[PDB]
Design a protein around this ligand. Structure first.
Ligand SMILES: *[C@@H]1O[C@H](CO)[C@@H](O)[C@H](O)[C@H]1NC(C)=O
Ligand SMILES: COc1cc(/C=C/C(=O)O)ccc1O
Ligand SMILES: COc1cc(/C=C/C(=O)O)ccc1O
Length: 261
């Protein structure tokens, strides 16, 4: 289906996670007041940047990754070789985008130790992972690993590439209850004709998982669509090309601009 309209509560949640993702490009400018900032995640070889955060009000530990912000990150973006996802031996025949797998391995020990430290102290909190574009694929690989280790794992992505093959997409669909929009814990958000959700091309053995939430302009709850099933539809049907204007700006927030309250 491609169903018009979402609730005000869900729209507010998508805008909150988009704000965190776009603020990750400018040292977390103007993130919600309900959030305590924890340790920085960083690797010098890959230039992967992220943070661990905590929202006591909503009882969640949030991990965010920045998208592309350097020449080194652009090199990762264009390594389209599929690589076995050996992080999860139980993910049968799962393969991931080769550049993003290097990025994930380069920060894995930091992410896992910092998440363990928070989860051990707040064992009833949910774990949420988010990011934009390259940061969205970093979030997907991270959330897959956490889902095998913890309860109540959630994933909000914005302008996400195809992160791996169909086996990886179906593992995520099962682990995140994607079979209904009423149960999903994986919200794969897209905007208008963003070109990045069309890369790598599906013909190279790549696939998306999750429920797609497609924001059409002008943006609002009533002009966001819920997209499920195998038909080409929503953002992917628009056939946008590459890094374009729609890619940069989600719910009126441009990466790193700090124009939000
Ligand atoms: C692409 O990434 C994979 C790991 O996921 C790596 O083994 C391979 O050598 C990379 N390709 C290049 C050209 O660096
Ligand atoms: C998956 O393919 C690509 C992804 C990006 C990501 C851009 C960003 O994080 O801004 C750029 C070029 C690509 O070919
Ligand atoms: C030009 O102004 C508008 C256009 C739309 C169109 C919605 C769509 O076709 O999906 C919605 C609200 C507006 O204020």
């Amino acid at each position: 289906a491609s169903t018009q309209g979402i609730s005000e509560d869900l729209y507010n949640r998508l805008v909150e996670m988009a704000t965190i993702s776009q603020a990750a490009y400018a040292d977390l400018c103007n993130i919600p007041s309900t959030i305590i900032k924890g340790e920085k995640i960083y690797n010098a070889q890959t230039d992967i940047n992220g943070w661990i955060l905590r929202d006591d009000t909503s009882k969640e530990i949030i991990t965010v990754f920045r998208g592309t912000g350097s020449d080194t990150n652009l090199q990762l973006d264009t390594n389209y070789t599929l690589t076995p996802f050996d992080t999860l031996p139980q993910c049968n025949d799962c393969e991931v985008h080769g550049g993003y797998y290097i990025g994930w391995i380069s920060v894995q020990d930091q992410v896992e130790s910092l998440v363990k430290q928070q989860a051990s102290q707040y064992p009833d909190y949910a774990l949420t992972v988010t990011g934009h574009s390259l940061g969205a694929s970093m979030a997907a690989l991270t959330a897959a690993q956490l889902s095998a280790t913890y309860d109540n794992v959630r994933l909000y992505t914005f302008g996400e590439p195809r992160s791996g093959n169909q086996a990886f997409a179906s593992y995520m669909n099962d682990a995140f209850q994607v079979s209904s929009p009423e149960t999903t814990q994986y919200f794969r958000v897209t905007h208008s004709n963003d070109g990045i959700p069309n890369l790598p091309p599906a013909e190279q053995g790549y696939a998306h998982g999750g429920v797609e939430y497609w924001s059409v302009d002008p943006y609002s709850a009533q002009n966001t669509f819920v997209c499920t099933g195998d038909e080409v539809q929503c953002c992917e049907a628009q056939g946008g090309q590459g890094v374009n204007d729609a890619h940069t700006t989600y719910f009126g927030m441009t990466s790193g601009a700090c124009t939000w309250v």
